[PDB]
Amino acid sequence: MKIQMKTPLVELDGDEMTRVLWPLIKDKLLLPFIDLQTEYYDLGIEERDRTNDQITIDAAEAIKKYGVGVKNATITPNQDRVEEYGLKEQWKSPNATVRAMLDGTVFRKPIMVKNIKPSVRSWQKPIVVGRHAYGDFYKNAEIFAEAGGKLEIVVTDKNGKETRQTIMEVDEPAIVQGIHNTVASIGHFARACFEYSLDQKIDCWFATKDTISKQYDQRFKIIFEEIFAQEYKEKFAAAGIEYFYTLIDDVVARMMKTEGGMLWACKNYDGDVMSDMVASAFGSLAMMSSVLVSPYGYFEYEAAHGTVQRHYYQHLKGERTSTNPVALIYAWTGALRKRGELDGTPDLCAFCDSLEAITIECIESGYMTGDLARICEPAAIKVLDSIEFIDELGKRLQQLNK
């Protein structure tokens, strides 16, 4: 028209190859069609270093203010990255920071095409990973205890009452880690999962190791059971779907023999691992949608994958790459859809439906980046480099006048 927006999208930029691709998507796919309103936050590793990570806090506060963010893939610096970039320090994960500030559950679902069959034989139906976005080792405290010692966790409440437990007592160099979660957050996580399963009419599976983690993981098991029995058991029976709880090593065994079609609830760490397992097995890592659904009414759409470092070095050498931009696209269309829905601007939502359908129909016709070409049946017609792929969807958008 161009399509009009009422509220800005909060836009969080990122690193490496996905940072290169981000402007191509906007320039070729969105800006010809939508008069795009965003509040831009650069969460590139250099901007985070330049502002001592403050820009991450700003972006998260902007998501809370406007309601919906879209996030590009970022580097979390370790010792290698600090060296590579000249960093002041090993900054904390911007994802960990944003998710802590929002709370919620990250729903991760493969983006399926008809010409790619899953790596796992039995899998017919999509598997959705519902990842708790809050706590555990994404807000860790750690110590390199270079002389060993008595290793403990200590809680001191607001009246000054302390409780202490000994992890171990050793007399040699050791490492110590502590994590937390909250009762309230685990509750929001169970509810978000139970709500998602009902809405989508799929079973819900959850698993921890509550036989080893007798108070921590067992707390998650307890809360899911009580919330389920007190609030969802009957809606579940009415909708004809089931909650299934088991141990985590066991759930992954069953997952290898399952036909899929369930919501796999996961603790924060497990959901990181298993969401990559699931994306990879269904297709490739780029073929996955990811949305953080917060209990406070915010949404953050993101890619689940990383910044494709190896393709980036190729790009810096002046090479074209066939980097799959699909998860970045779905982040944009996932965010713009939610924005238009919140705003009562359904032509924005309509555009999003189209750009998603065009992406799928392009790949299914045999026009695709190299990750998908390696695995499609029948063989691709054309193995497009990133820019060509994005131009091809651009062309299809135009051939509707959109």
**Which positions from 190 through 209 interact with its own copies, judged by CB under 8 A?**
209
How far apart CA 286 and CA 221 sit, in angstroms, is 32
Q: Is the Cβ of residue 152 or residue 199 nearer to its own copies in the bound state?
A: 152
Tell me how far, at minimum, the Cβ of 318 lies from its own copies, in Å.
26
| Residues 393, 351 contacting (CB under 8 angstroms) | no
Contacting its own copies (CB under 8 A), which of 4, 54, 119, 398? 119
Contacting Mg ion (CB under 5 A), which of 162, 171, 172, 249? 249
> Any contact of residue 272 with Mg ion (CB under 5 A)?
yes
Contacting its own copies (CB under 8 A), which of 6, 88, 114, 164? 164
| Residues 131, 108 contacting (CB under 8 angstroms) | yes
Contacting its own copies (CB under 8 A), which of 121, 233, 320, 382? 121
Contacting its own copies (CB under 8 A), which of 155, 237, 316, 381? 155
CB neighbours of 195 closer than 8 A, spacing ≥ 6?
none
Structure tokens at 283: 């297709």
CA angle 99, 105, 110 (to 5 degrees): 110
Count of beta carbons in the 10 Å neighbourhood of residue 253: 12
Q: Is the Cβ of residue 145 or residue 198 nearer to its own copies in the bound state?
A: 145
How far apart CA 129 and CA 279 sit, in angstroms, is 10
Q: Which of 111, 113, 106, 104 is nearest to 127 (CA)?
A: 111
Tell me how far, at minimum, the Cβ of 172 lies from its own copies, in Å.
5
Q: How far is CA 177 from CA 106, 135, 168, in A?
A: 24, 13, 12
Rg of the chain over Cα atoms, rounded to whole angstroms, equals 22
Return the range that interacts with its own copies (CB under 8 A); candidates 38-46, 235-243, 265-273, 331-339: 265-273
Tell me how far, at minimum, the Cβ of 84 lies from Mg ion, in Å.
14
Q: Print the binding letters for residues 281-320 with Mg ion: x by CB under 5 A, - otherwise.
A: -------------------------x--------------
Q: Which residues are annotated as a binding site for D-threo-isocitrate?
A: 76, 93-99, 108, 131, 138, 209, 272, 306, 308, 324
